[PDB]
Each structure stands twice: as structure tokens, then as C-alpha cells.
């Protein structure tokens, strides 16, 4: 038909014909054929209105104008209904089931995607692009929401993994990826509005995720004691979401960035807190156990450090930008740590973490020592980490006290992931830590021997001494000093075989070679040595071996 030269009578007849076809509906007519009939009506309408066309203004013409307009309007409304209907063929569902059963979320069939794209193109083609886009956005939005609704409860909810945020987050990652595939399927490869459409469907989900995430981060802040290490799970959570959004345009991306900042400070505060927790715990009890054994502070410190080692991935990941000052106290005194400028890749996460554990162990030892010095010498300023401090008159007992606690620290590390996290310089700093306190236990012995040696020097300047009483006096002093030290040393029973063997060797190494030389030097100042010299070197050795074991 040539619309420009056709009578309104013939045109109207054509229209009524097209109407009968449309009345049958989309399915009977065929979707593509249906839209084509509407296009014919639309094109007819335009061909008879235009200024070019100059038809008389009578009821006949007005009647066909309204008829075409309304018929097109009703047909397009049936098209939206059809569109909405296909979108809702997929019903709300519990993603957890799909996650558990390892099944893909429901998806539209090829023919349905084809019908949806055809209708999208139809409306974009008739200047209703955004209209149909909002319908699509809207339908998808409330559908996804209803699915996530099955998890919002379990995630508002510390056993590692115990939280509905993990599966919740997993569910969200599934929808995010599925929606991207849907948009890529519905539009031409380079359709400019794809990113925009996807964003309208995902932003609400993100807004909801962000809320919940912010909620959990609140609970953690409140009951930090039992939820402290939960932040580690929240971190991988937001990291996973952000990773899934790479390249995707978003409206409220700011929410996630703020979440990444709020959860990064929390985890950062855990390490810094660990130290202060140790400092406060070590100085909480002013008294020293009478048996000089393991303390509460040590038990607590190791139990905590054992926890961190359960999130090696989180801890290591948390070492990002993280530094040693970010956890060390502002006081920070070099001599109170076993760290040695041994040039290490300080940019390595494993190195940074390792240091953290070592600093924690150093802090426990030195603070327990400070508390011990304050307890035994109330009026003195603590001089910690100094085996040579003459002012400290209790080095032996203190050394033992710290070693007994370090014995537990070592055990907890060995039987733990901590053993691996310290491999290398970690275990090395710990040995240096033990040496310092073994050195404390052996210090009084050095004084004994240094004293004996000074009295020999001062007396051996001129001719060899024949002064029996002066010589007898030198032995007497040694004997008294010896016996007093043997006596005190018996008050401390180490449990660790390794520490016992070391103490034994070091004590014998200091005393025996010097006594043998002192003895051979002066024994013959007497006709019968046995009567003026209490111990022969062999008798002295016997006494020391009994003490050791």
C-alpha cells in the first residue's frame, strides 16, 4: 500500500486488519512478526501526519489518527508485559543451596535472551531506551535482593570461618559475575550503556553489602576480645568483592573504598595492640611467682600469638605498608630487642611478620624482667637486657625466671605454625634472647672467678710469695664465694635439657680451668696442702658436677 496516496478509508481498513493480527497476541503471531506489524502502524501514522501529507481535518482523519496511536500504545504495553514476564521466569532462590550443592545460579535460555534483546532494541528504536532499561534494571534488582535476603540474616552475626559473611560474599560474587554475563549477552558488544546498566543493578547490592560489612566491623569494634581476628576474614571479603568489580563502572564505589580503609586500620591495630597487651599483662602482677616459673602473661601472650599464626595469610597480607613502628611503642629502646642490622629484605611480608613475632617475644621477656627488677629492687631504675649490670644484684634468679617463661614460648612455637613463620632470623633472635638470660644466670660466677684472678695478679708482682697466711686467705675467700654460689644455684631447677647442658658447660668452663691454675700455683706454699686447702681441683669438680645435672 502507498500510504501517501491512499484514502483514509483504505488506510483504516488496513489498520483494522493489522489489529486483528495483533489481537492474537505475541506468542501466536511470533515476537519478531508482532513488532513488525506495530512498526507498520507506526510508519503509517507518520506517513499521514507529516506536513508533507496535507489531509483534511475531519472526523474520519482524526479517527484513524487516534486509532493508530492507541493501537500502537496498547501493543507496546503488551510488549513490556511480555518483557517483564520473561525476566521473572527466574524465581528468588537461596544461593547457599547452590553454593553447597555446587550448582550454577539459574539463567535464561538462549531464546529468552533473544526475545529480551529484541524487545530492548525495539524500545531503544522508538526513543524509549531508558524506559525499558529501568524496567530491566528494576526487575533484576528486586530479584537479586530477594535471593540475598536468605543470607542477610546469617551474615549480621569467634570460630574461624564461623560467619555468614563468607557464603554471603560468595553469593554476591556469583551474582556480580552472572549479571556481567547477562549484560554482555543482552547488548551488542560495544553498546555504550552496558557499563551504566550493569552499575544500576550492582550498586544497590554493593550498598547493601557495604552496610552489613560496616555492621560486622562495628560488632568487632565492640567485643574486640573475642572478635578481634574476625577483621582478617572481612579483609579477604572486601578484597574478593573489589577484585570481582575490576573494570566495572560503579556509582557507590566510594562505599567499598571506605570499608577497605575502616577494616585496614582495625587489622593494623591488632598487631599494635598485641604489643601493648603484652606490656600491660607483664606489669599487671607486681609479684614474682615464688617458684619463678611460667606466668599468666606468657600463657596469654603465646595463646594470642598462636591465633595470629592461624591467619598467616591475613597477617602476611596485613604487613602491606605496615611497618615496625606501626606496632612498636613510641618509647622504643633498641637494646630491648634482639633485632640486628643484618640487612634483610624489609619489603618482604614474611620478613616483616617474622619480625613482629620476634618483637612480641622480646617485649614479653624484657617487660617480665623489668617487673622482676622492680619487684626485687623497688628503689632502683630497671637496667634491662644487661647481663653485666653490677647494680642488678639478682641476675641469677631473674635470668632463671625469664628462661622458665622462654621455655614455654619455645614449646608453643615448635608445636605451632609459628615455628615456620620464624624460620631463619626468627629462631636466631630467640636463641640470642635465651643466651642473654643464660648469661644472667652465669654472671655471678664470672664475678667469683674475676675476683680470684685479681687477687692472684696483685700478689704476683715481685718474687713468688712465701707468705703462707696471705695465701691461705686467698683460698678462704674463694671457698666462701664458691660455696655461697653453689648454694644459691641449687635454688633454681631448669626443666629444659638444652638449657641445663649449657648452664653446666658454661659454669664448669669458667671455674675449673682457673681453679686448676690457681691451685697448682699455690698448693706447694704448704708442706701438706690438704690441711690448708679445702678443695683439690678434682674435689671441686665433683661438687660442680653434682650441682649441674
From Swiss-Prot:
<dbReference type="InterPro" id="IPR004140">
    <property type="entry name" value="Exo70"/>
</dbReference>
<protein>
    <recommendedName>
        <fullName>Exocyst complex component EXO70</fullName>
    </recommendedName>
</protein>
<keyword id="KW-0268">Exocytosis</keyword>
<dbReference type="InterPro" id="IPR046364">
    <property type="entry name" value="Exo70_C"/>
</dbReference>
<dbReference type="GO" id="GO:0007266">
    <property type="term" value="P:Rho protein signal transduction"/>
</dbReference>
<dbReference type="GO" id="GO:0006904">
    <property type="term" value="P:vesicle docking involved in exocytosis"/>
</dbReference>
<dbReference type="GO" id="GO:0005737">
    <property type="term" value="C:cytoplasm"/>
</dbReference>
<dbReference type="GO" id="GO:0005934">
    <property type="term" value="C:cellular bud tip"/>
</dbReference>
<dbReference type="GO" id="GO:0005546">
    <property type="term" value="F:phosphatidylinositol-4,5-bisphosphate binding"/>
</dbReference>
<dbReference type="GO" id="GO:0030133">
    <property type="term" value="C:transport vesicle"/>
</dbReference>
<dbReference type="GO" id="GO:0000131">
    <property type="term" value="C:incipient cellular bud site"/>
</dbReference>
<dbReference type="InterPro" id="IPR016159">
    <property type="entry name" value="Cullin_repeat-like_dom_sf"/>
</dbReference>
<dbReference type="GO" id="GO:0005935">
    <property type="term" value="C:cellular bud neck"/>
</dbReference>
<keyword id="KW-0653">Protein transport</keyword>
<dbReference type="GO" id="GO:0051601">
    <property type="term" value="P:exocyst localization"/>
</dbReference>
<dbReference type="GO" id="GO:0000145">
    <property type="term" value="C:exocyst"/>
</dbReference>
<dbReference type="Pfam" id="PF03081">
    <property type="entry name" value="Exo70_C"/>
</dbReference>
<dbReference type="GO" id="GO:0006887">
    <property type="term" value="P:exocytosis"/>
</dbReference>
<keyword id="KW-0813">Transport</keyword>
<dbReference type="GO" id="GO:0006893">
    <property type="term" value="P:Golgi to plasma membrane transport"/>
</dbReference>
<dbReference type="GO" id="GO:0001927">
    <property type="term" value="P:exocyst assembly"/>
</dbReference>
<comment type="subunit">
    <text>The exocyst complex is composed of SEC3, SEC5, SEC6, SEC8, SEC10, SEC15, EXO70 and EXO84. Interacts with RHO3.</text>
</comment>
<dbReference type="GO" id="GO:0005628">
    <property type="term" value="C:prospore membrane"/>
</dbReference>
<comment type="function">
    <text>Involved in the secretory pathway as part of the exocyst complex which tethers secretory vesicles to the sites of exocytosis. Plays a role in the assembly of the exocyst.</text>
</comment>
<dbReference type="GO" id="GO:0005886">
    <property type="term" value="C:plasma membrane"/>
</dbReference>
<dbReference type="GO" id="GO:0031267">
    <property type="term" value="F:small GTPase binding"/>
</dbReference>
<dbReference type="GO" id="GO:0015031">
    <property type="term" value="P:protein transport"/>
</dbReference>
<dbReference type="GO" id="GO:0043332">
    <property type="term" value="C:mating projection tip"/>
</dbReference>
<dbReference type="Pfam" id="PF20669">
    <property type="entry name" value="Exo70_N"/>
</dbReference>
<comment type="similarity">
    <text>Belongs to the EXO70 family.</text>
</comment>
<keyword id="KW-0968">Cytoplasmic vesicle</keyword>
Amino acid at each position: 500500500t502507498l500510504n501517501s496516496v491512499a484514502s483514509v478509508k483504505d488506510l483504516a481498513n488496513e489498520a483494522s486488519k493489522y489489529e486483528i493480527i495483533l489481537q492474537k497476541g505475541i506468542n501466536q503471531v511470533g515476537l519478531k512478526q508482532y513488532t513488525q506489524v506495530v512498526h507498520k502502524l507506526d510508519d503509517m501514522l507518520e506517513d499521514i501526519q507529516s506536513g508533507q501529507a496535507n489531509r483534511e481535518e475531519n472526523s474520519e482523519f482524526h479517527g484513524i489518527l487516534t486509532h493508530l496511536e492507541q493501537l500502537i500504545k496498547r501493543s507496546e504495553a503488551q510488549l513490556r508485559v511480555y518483557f517483564i514476564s520473561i525476566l521473572n521466569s527466574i524465581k528468588p532462590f537461596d544461593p547457599q543451596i547452590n553454593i553447597t550443592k555446587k550448582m550454577p545460579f539459574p539463567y535464561y535460555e538462549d531464546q529468552q535472551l533473544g526475545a529480551l534483546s529484541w524487545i530492548l532494541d525495539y524500545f531503544h528504536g522508538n526513543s524509549e531506551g531508558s524506559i525499558i532499561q529501568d524496567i530491566l534494571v528494576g526487575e533484576r534488582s528486586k530479584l537479586i535482593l530477594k535471593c540475598m535476603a536468605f543470607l542477610e540474616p546469617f551474615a549480621k552475626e569467634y570460630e574461624k570461618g564461623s560467619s555468614g559473611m563468607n557464603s554471603y560474599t560468595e553469593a554476591l560474587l556469583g551474582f556480580i559475575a552472572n549479571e556481567k554475563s547477562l549484560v554482555d549477552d543482552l547488548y551488542s558488544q560495544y553498546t555504550e550503556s552496558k557499563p551504566h546498566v550493569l552499575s544500576q543493578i550492582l550498586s544497590p547490592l554493593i550498598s547493601a553489602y557495604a552496610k552489613l560489612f560496616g555492621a560486622n566491623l562495628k560488632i568487632v569494634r565492640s567485643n574486640l576480645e573475642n572478635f578481634g581476628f574476625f577483621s582478617f576474614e572481612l579483609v579477604e571479603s572486601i578484597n574478593d568483592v573489589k577484585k570481582s568489580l575490576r573494570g566495572k563502572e560503579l556509582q557507590n564505589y566510594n562505599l567499598l573504598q571506605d570499608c577497605t580503609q575502616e577494616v585496614r586500620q582495625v587489622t593494623q591495630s591488632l598487631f599494635r595492640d598485641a604489643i601493648d597487651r603484652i606490656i600491660k599483662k607483664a606489669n599487671s602482677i607486681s609479684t614474682i611467682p615464688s617458684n619463678n616459673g611460667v606466668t599468666e602473661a606468657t600463657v596469654d601472650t603465646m595463646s594470642r600469638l598462636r591465633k595470629f599464626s592461624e591467619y598467616k595469610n591475613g597477617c602476611l597480607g596485613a604487613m602491606d605498608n605496615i611497618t615496625r613502628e606501626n606496632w612498636l611503642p613510641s618509647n622504643y629502646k633498641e637494646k630491648e630487642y634482639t633485632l640486628q642490622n643484618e640487612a634483610l629484605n624489609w619489603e618482604d611480608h614474611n620478613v616483616l611478620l617474622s619480625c613482629f613475632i620476634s618483637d612480641c617475644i622480646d617485649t614479653l621477656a624484657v617487660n617480665l624482667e623489668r617487673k622482676a627488677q622492680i619487684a626485687l629492687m623497688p628503689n632502683q631504675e630497671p637496667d634491662v637486657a644487661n647481663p653485666n649490670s653490677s647494680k642488678n644484684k639478682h641476675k641469677q634468679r631473674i635470668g632463671f625466671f625469664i628462661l622458665m617463661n622462654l621455655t614455654l614460648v619455645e614449646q608453643i612455637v615448635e608445636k605451632s605454625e609459628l615455628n615456620l613463620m620464624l624460620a631463619g632470623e626468627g629462631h636466631s633472635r630467640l636463641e640470642r634472647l635465651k643466651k642473654r638470660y643464660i648469661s644472667y644466670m652465669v654472671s655471678d660466677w664470672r664475678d667469683l672467678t674475676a675476683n680470684l684472678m685479681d687477687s692472684v695478679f696483685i700478689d704476683s708482682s715481685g718474687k713468688k710469695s712465701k707468705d703462707k697466711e696471705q695465701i691461705k686467705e686467698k683460698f678462704r675467700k674463694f671457698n666462701e664465694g664458691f660455696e655461697d654460689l653453689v648454694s644459691k644455684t641449687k635454688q633454681y631447677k631448669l626443666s629444659d635439657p638444652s638449657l641445663k647442658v649449657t648452664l653446666k658447660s658454661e659454669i664448669i668452663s669458667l671455674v675449673m680451668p682457673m681453679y686448676e691454675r690457681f691451685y697448682s700455683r699455690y698448693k706447694d706454699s704448704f708442706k701438706n696442702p690438704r690441711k690448708h686447702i679445702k678443695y683439690t681441683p678434682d674435689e671441686l669438680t665433683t661438687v660442680l658436677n653434682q650441682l649441674v645435672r
